[PDB]
Amino acid sequence: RPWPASLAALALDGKLRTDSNATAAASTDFGNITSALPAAVLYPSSTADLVALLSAANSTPGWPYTIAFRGRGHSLMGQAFAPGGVVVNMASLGDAAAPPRINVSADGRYVDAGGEQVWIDVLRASLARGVAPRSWTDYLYLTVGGTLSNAGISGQAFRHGPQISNVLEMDVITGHGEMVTCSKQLNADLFDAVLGGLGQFGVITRARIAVEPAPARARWVRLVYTDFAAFSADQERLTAPRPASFGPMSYVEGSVFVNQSLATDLANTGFFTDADVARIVALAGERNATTVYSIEATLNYDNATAAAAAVDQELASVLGTLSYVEGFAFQRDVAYAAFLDRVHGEEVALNKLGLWRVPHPWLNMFVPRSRIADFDRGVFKGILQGTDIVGQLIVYPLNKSMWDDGMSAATPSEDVFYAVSLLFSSVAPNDLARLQEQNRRILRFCDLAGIQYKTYLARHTDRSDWVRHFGAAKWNRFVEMKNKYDPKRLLSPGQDIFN
Ligand SMILES: *Cc1cc2c(cc1C)nc1c(=O)[nH]c(=O)nc-1n2C[C@H](O)[C@H](O)[C@H](O)COP(=O)(O)OP(=O)(O)OC[C@H]1O[C@@H](n2cnc3c(N)ncnc32)[C@H](O)[C@@H]1O
Ligand SMILES: *[C@@H]1O[C@H](CO)[C@@H](O[C@@H]2O[C@H](CO)[C@@H](O)[C@H](O)[C@H]2NC(C)=O)[C@H](O)[C@H]1NC(C)=O
Ligand SMILES: CC(C)=CCNc1ncnc2[nH]cnc12
Ligand SMILES: *[C@@H]1O[C@H](CO)[C@@H](O)[C@H](O)[C@H]1NC(C)=O
Ligand SMILES: *[C@@H]1O[C@H](CO)[C@@H](O)[C@H](O)[C@H]1NC(C)=O
Numbered sequence: 001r002p003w004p005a006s007l008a009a010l011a012l013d014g015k016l017r018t019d020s021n022a023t024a025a026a027s028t029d030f031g032n033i034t035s036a037l038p039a040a041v042l043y044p045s046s047t048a049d050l051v052a053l054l055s056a057a058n059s060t061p062g063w064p065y066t067i068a069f070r071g072r073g074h075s076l077m078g079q080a081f082a083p084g085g086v087v088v089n090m091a092s093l094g095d096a097a098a099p100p101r102i103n104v105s106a107d108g109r110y111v112d113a114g115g116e117q118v119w120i121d122v123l124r125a126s127l128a129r130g131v132a133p134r135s136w137t138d139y140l141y142l143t144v145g146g147t148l149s150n151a152g153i154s155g156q157a158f159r160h161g162p163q164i165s166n167v168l169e170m171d172v173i174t175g176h177g178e179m180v181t182c183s184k185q186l187n188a189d190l191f192d193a194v195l196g197g198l199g200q201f202g203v204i205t206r207a208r209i210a211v212e213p214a215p216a217r218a219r220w221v222r223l224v225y226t227d228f229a230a231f232s233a234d235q236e237r238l239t240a241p242r243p244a245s246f247g248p249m250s251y252v253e254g255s256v257f258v259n260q261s262l263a264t265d266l267a268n269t270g271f272f273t274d275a276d277v278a279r280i281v282a283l284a285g286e287r288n289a290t291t292v293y294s295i296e297a298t299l300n301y302d303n304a305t306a307a308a309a310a311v312d313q314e315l316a317s318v319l320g321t322l323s324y325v326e327g328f329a330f331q332r333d334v335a336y337a338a339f340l341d342r343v344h345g346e347e348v349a350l351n352k353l354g355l356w357r358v359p360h361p362w363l364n365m366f367v368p369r370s371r372i373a374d375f376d377r378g379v380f381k382g383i384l385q386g387t388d389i390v391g392q393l394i395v396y397p398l399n400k401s402m403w404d405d406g407m408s409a410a411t412p413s414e415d416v417f418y419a420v421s422l423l424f425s426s427v428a429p430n431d432l433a434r435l436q437e438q439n440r441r442i443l444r445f446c447d448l449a450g451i452q453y454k455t456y457l458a459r460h461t462d463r464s465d466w467v468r469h470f471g472a473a474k475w476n477r478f479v480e481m482k483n484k485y486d487p488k489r490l491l492s493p494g495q496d497i498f499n
Contacts, residue, residue: 007056010042010049016086017041026087031076032359033432036083036494039065043092047173047205053086054203055177057490066493069203071146072118074139076362077459078494079198080146085493088203090116090143104129104211110168111211115145115204122209123340131211132336135160138253138394139343145204149492150457151196151409153398153419155251155296158239161402163209164195164409171206175486179205193481196409199492200478201485215300218250218339219311222271223295223319224280224328228376231293232397234322236369236416238297239397248318250300256380256393257292259284265389270346271296276330283325291380293395295324298339359426361435363442366454369397369416378445383438394421408478410454410470419456459495466497 003011010016017023022041044050057063066085073080081087093116094101101114102125111133113122119133120140126132136154137147148170152163160166169183172194180202182191193201225231231254238252257265262284266277284292299315301307319329350356367375372395380393400415411417422442426432446453460466467475482489482498493499 002060004052004056004059006052010044010052015043015045015049017043022089023087026070026073026089027081029073029075029078029080030360031078031362032357033076033361033436034078034081036078036081038068038082038087039084040086041089042086043089045092045095047093047171047179050088050173050203050205051177051179053088053177054173054175057488058176063488063490066490066499068492068494069115069145069199071116071143072141074142074146075494076360076457079459079492081494083493085490090145092116093205100125102126104131108213109211111209113144113207113209115143115171115206117144118142119144119147120341120344123337126211127214127337130214132214133163133166133209134212135163135166136340137163139347140341141344141347144207144209145199148195148204148207149197149199153456155253155298155396157402157419158252158397158399159246159249159402161399161404162409164407165402165404166210167191167195168208168210170194170204170208172202172204174202175488175491183208189481190485192404192407193478193485195404195407197481198408198495198497200408200482200495200497201491203491215250215336216303217301217307218334218336219299219301219315220271220332220334220339221295221297221299221315221319222269222330223297223322223324224283224330225293225295225324226284226287226289226291228291228293228373228380230323231295232372232376234324235295235397237321238295238318239399239416241399241401248299248314249297251296251298253296253394253396255294255296256376256395257294258380258384258387258389258393259290259292260386261389262292265392266292269294270342271332272330280328283328290385291376300336355425359432359435361424361426361432361439362457363420363422363424363439364456364458365420365446366398366412366456367418367420367446368412368414368452369418370414371449371451371453372418374449375418375420375446375451378449379442383442383445387438390425390427391423392421394419394423405474408470408481410474412452412454417454459497461496 018040026041027035027037066082068082069088070080103112135156263281266272424435489498
């Protein structure tokens with residue numbers, strides 16, 4: 001039962017809290033489906049406080065508290081909880097002012113960011129110094145440590161790889177309470193374990209993120225299809241490596257619209273005008289389509305005098321290689337930061353309607369390219385038909401060559417695989433249960449069809465499921481690494497890997 005001086009010091013300084021207000025805030029997440037109250041919440045003011053907790057945890061025999069690192073609690077199924085344990089309120093690391101938590105290098109080649117920092121702030125501190133990270137998430141209010149413990153994907157990942165592929169080095173406090181600086185050169189076994197590591201090996205206090213010169217603007221396009229074969233062939237053409245080298249597109253994503261909610265979902269993009277919506281709805285009726293697909297792509301560009309006309313010509317050449325329905329190219333032109341933060345607006349709009357802090361039974365997965373047409377038929381044209389869709393259905397290809405298989409993040413074996421993100425929002429408890437059963441049905445459809453998919457952002461509750469997730473050989477490596485960095489099995493228990 002005794003406490004080390006540094007641990008008891010945190011209680012004394014009002015950093016380690018047990019009050020109902022502190023525990024309740026760290027007991028819910030974005031998912032809004034599961035909840036688990038912690039025994040205590042840590043609000044650290046420095047990384048020494050994280051060393052204190054973790055050294056205490058490693059030195060104290062029979063220590064009973066599990067420890068989680070709450071980024072912004074964007075988790076869907078309690079991955080950031082420490083049931084009857086200690087939740088770290090990471091955001092407290094950036095409360096002071098001195099020293100700054102985000103530092104762009106003097107050479108403009110990278111950005112050092114605190115593990116707790118949010119990407120929108122990383123973007124602002126980078127843009128002030130004329131640079132910006134190269135690989136994003138669709139939504140910017142997530143933590144560096146949180147996205148890096150998953151993968152971090154968006155429409156730039158086909159050409160720059162996920163966020164985990166754009167990290168030069170990190171400062172990690174292991175489950176032993178040891179401060180370790182790691183990279184591909186120094187303690188690479190920890191660096192690889194942590195990236196896509198689901199917070200199992202230690203906490204990321206600093207990450208060195210690759211940057212590129214900041215473009216000023218984004219020419220933003222949406223291309224419409226009624227044929228899945230043409231839509232997927234075009235997303236693959238736009239993202240294909242040209243014989244290490246890529247095409248002109250800075251970002252490529254896509255979306256599916258089911259016939260039943262077509263006009264409403266197109267209008268809810270925040271992209272199409274009512275005149276654009278009417279034309280697409282009419283197109284669907286002419287082709288007798290039960291689904292409509294849209295490619296979403298950008299072309300990043302600088303403030304140059306000729307830039308605008310050069311972009312028009314470059315975009316026109318790219319579009320001429322494509323097979324979208326003639327006359328169904330829709331363009332917008334925005335400032336680069338506005339494109340990157342396009343989702344914050346959706347968060348604000350939904351929150352005031354009371355439609356943001358609702359259950360999110362999201363289904364996110366990686367589907368091998370060879371089975372995407374089967375997934376489209378069984379899911380978009382099958383299971384989802386005749387349902388009212390509240391949310392987005394995002395589908396886009398990724399290049400495996402840009403993913404490091406030695407890292408923890410699990411991906412399909414094929415060269416090309418699609419990110420498939422089914423972002424359902426629940427409208428009622430009976431709608432929640434219906435949505436949770438529908439997600440089980442989609443996964444069952446994939447299993448019965450022999451689709452070798454990988455989930456993303458999901459936590460498995462069975463050992464056999466986590467072994468199948470990583471793959472048996474890659475699983476043994478994840479175990480070896482757990483035994484090295486968290487032998488007491490306390491870190492991020494909400495993943496249900498070792499807890
Ligand atoms: C809510 C949401 C999430 C989201 C998204 C849009 C919204 C509205 N768009 C995404 C996208 O386009 N691409 C992508 O890859 N992910 C996207 N997400 C999911 C997001 O990555 C996850 O929610 C993720 O967990 C990041 O969120 P957060 O920063 O809020 O992290 P957490 O949920 O609290 O914790 C996740 C796990 O990681 C461990 N953790 C957290 N911080 C650290 C640090 N610094 N070091 C080590 N481990 C850490 C937690 O313990 C937990 O297990
Ligand atoms: C797409 O969905 C619409 C409904 O939003 C279908 O249009 C309806 O068709 C039914 C039966 O054929 C009629 O009873 C309704 O009066 C129609 N309602 C509207 C608002 O048009 C349409 O058939 C669907 N198309 C496909 C190809 O499935
Ligand atoms: C991988 C993942 C969860 C992407 C989410 N992307 C998103 N993309 C666009 N709008 C959104 N609203 C919520 N999430 C949105
Ligand atoms: C879901 O969010 C609502 C609104 O904040 C709240 O009533 C409820 O406790 C949440 N449920 C879970 C399981 O987090
Ligand atoms: C329109 O498509 C539907 C559903 O996909 C099919 O059942 C129907 O027979 C079609 N109509 C024609 C004229 O092909």
